[PDB]
């Protein structure tokens, strides 16, 4: 199962810039033996949340040898025997041997590849180790939330340590970092806020309990068997005649929140796509090099 | 590996009806190479939440061939990452290319493959798109928690659902969470200045009804707020614990539908190629 992509007549030189991108992933649409370049392409500055949603409605595919005519590609998900394949690392900080890798859009300052003559641009998502992939998005949304409330400027928290070195985490809004990541920040902070307030509405006296015994006692009795006062959750007051301007059924908001939280959690990656298994090479690959990876 | 679920003698008026089951999945309990039909079996409909709790401790398998003597199968996921097989849609919704599939117990019941000869009947569970089974499970657990085309709840195991939900919700409350909560007014005033921000917040958001009723003072600085920072820890907890929230409630995705040559969508009641993940 290998697929090629039809390349239009770009130019001399630019074709070489493309051939120097020979290991990065691109997302096909339908597993058909003939797809065109115009198909596998996105606006190179866009909403990172929408890009993350698209990254699931598609099949991954890694670019094998490129030639002036076409460029082959191997899909990831479908397949048998887990055949290996070279994969070019494009993450900010490097990754070592034997750790799961995941795909995220260029969250930070973007790096689009732009074909001038074809009049089409391409997006190549970063490849991060699992833990740090879970961590970097939290880092950036924390920075956005800090600059949201006008508090202290920075305490030096825009650093991430990984394999000896420490990354600088470039300043925000350099190209469009403020704009491309805004909807994600909002959809996350609003959801956490919502979940917390719903919780607190469902059980009234949580925060006012013993900060060292009563709280702990509630948690340990909930985690254990179902005493739960019986119905520890107090019956909220009944709502209005359902046509008023101030009707508030807390349980419909609860179902809406469960739905939204699930649908968000889906579009966050945090599911390994491959697993580096380097052999006959340096045990660590720096950013911009090619490692032999085994698809999960 | 292939599971061999041996069958007793059945009615020729019903063996043939059971031959019409070629893409429906069944829930074993252990993975021995041989097994019996009397084993993989559930009673008629009832307690959808009990059922979905049952579909997590017992790994499933899809059947492939039905001969009058044996009935082969295939363990859905035990070591396979691309093991392509076929299974038929038996849900009310359709399914397009690419999207993952989930298994949810049969709704409303009345779908029971009755076998009067062996005196035993089955309930082949339905297959839904992911993002829609999410809504279904959310609705069911919300209505179950309400108890302090719809089946009546039980109040016996619904407390397990309420507990599993309220535990994960409670463990979201960190000393940094209130720092993020201290901007609800500052968030709302931003929501009304841009269209996208206003569209993000829903209508019955249950927080927009808080931003106009209650005031909160500046948040007190926590203990040793000069070395560490709680916002980032809070948000990492949030993402790590929300990336799997639906799983511990609903059912994990098991396969994604792929189609190489056929039409893009498969209508209900038709076999569809699939790759397991």
């Amino acid at each position: 199962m290998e697929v090629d992509i039809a390349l239009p007549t770009l130019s001399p030189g630019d074709l070489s810039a493309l051939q120097r991108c020979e290991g990065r992933v691109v997302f096909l649409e339908t597993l058909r033996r003939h797809a065109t370049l115009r198909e596998v392409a996105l606006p190179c500055g866009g909403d990172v949340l929408a890009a993350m949603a698209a990254y699931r409605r598609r099949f991954a595919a890694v670019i094998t040898r490129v030639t002036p005519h076409r460029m082959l590609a191997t899909p990831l998900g479908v397949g048998g025997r887990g055949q290996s394949l070279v994969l070019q690392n494009t993450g900010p900080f490097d990754l070592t041997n034997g750790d799961h890798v995941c795909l995220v859009p260029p969250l930070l300052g973007d790096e689009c590849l732009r074909l001038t003559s074809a009049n089409l641009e391409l997006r190549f998502p970063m490849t991060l180790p699992l833990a740090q992939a879970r961590e970097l998005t939290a880092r950036v949304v924390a920075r956005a939330a800090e600059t949201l409330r006008g508090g202290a400027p920075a305490r030096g928290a825009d650093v991430v340590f990984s394999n000896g070195r420490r990354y600088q985490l470039p300043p925000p809004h350099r190209d469009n970092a403020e704009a491309a990541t805004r909807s994600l920040v909002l959809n996350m902070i609003f959801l956490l806020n919502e979940g917390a307030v719903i919780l607190l509405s469902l059980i009234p006296n949580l925060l006012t309990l013993g900060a060292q015994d009563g709280y702990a006692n509630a948690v340990i009795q909930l985690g254990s068997a179902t005493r739960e006062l019986g119905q520890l959750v107090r019956q909220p007051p009944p709502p209005l005649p359902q046509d008023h301007a101030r009707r508030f059924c807390v349980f419909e908001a609860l179902e809406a929140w469960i739905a939204s939280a699930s649908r968000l959690g889906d579009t966050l990656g945090t599911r390994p796509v491959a697993r580096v298994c380097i052999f006959d090479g340096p045990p660590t690959v720096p950013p911009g090099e090619k490692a032999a990876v085994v698809e999960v | 590996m292939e599971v061999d679920i041996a069958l007793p003698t059945l009615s020729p008026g019903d063996l043939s009806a059971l031959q019409r089951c070629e893409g429906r999945v069944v829930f074993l309990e252990t993975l021995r190479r041989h097994a019996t039909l009397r084993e993989v079996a559930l009673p008629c409909g009832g307690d959808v939440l009990a059922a979905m709790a049952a579909y997590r401790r017992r790994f499933a398998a899809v059947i492939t061939r039905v001969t009058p003597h044996r009935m082969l199968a295939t363990p859905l996921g035990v070591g396979g990452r691309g093991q392509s097989l076929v299974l038929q849609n038996t849900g009310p919704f359709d399914l397009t290319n690419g999207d993952h599939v989930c298994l949810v117990p049969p709704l409303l019941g009345d779908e029971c493959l009755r076998l009067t000869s062996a005196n035993l009947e089955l309930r082949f569970p339905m297959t839904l798109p992911l993002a829609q089974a999410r809504e279904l499970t959310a609705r069911v657990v919300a209505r179950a928690a309400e108890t302090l085309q719809l089946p009546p709840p039980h109040r016996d195991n619904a407390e397990a659902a309420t507990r599993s939900l309220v535990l994960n919700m409670i463990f979201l409350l960190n000393e940094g969470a209130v720092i993020l909560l201290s901007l609800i007014p500052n968030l709302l005033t931003l929501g009304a200045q841009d269209g996208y921000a206003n569209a993000v917040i829903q209508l019955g958001s249950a927080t927009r009804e808080l931003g106009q009723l209650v005031r909160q003072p500046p948040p007190p600085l926590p203990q040793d707020h000069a070395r560490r920072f709680c916002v980032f820890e809070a948000l990492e907890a949030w993402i790590a614990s929300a990336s799997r929230l639906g799983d511990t409630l609903g059912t994990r995705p098991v396969a994604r539908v792929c189609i190489f040559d056929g039409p893009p969508t498969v209508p209900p009641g038709e076999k569809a190629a699939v790759v397991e993940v």
Binding site: G80, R81 | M1, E2, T74, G79, G80, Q83
Partner: peptide, 23 residues
């Protein structure tokens, strides 16, 4: 002095099709 033990390897990779389909 050039033909078929790497042209050996080459043709009859052939009698391997399962690489089974089962986990």
């Amino acid at each position: 002095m050039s033909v078929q033990i790497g042209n050996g390897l080459l043709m009859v990779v052939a009698p391997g099709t399962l690489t089974v389909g089962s986990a």
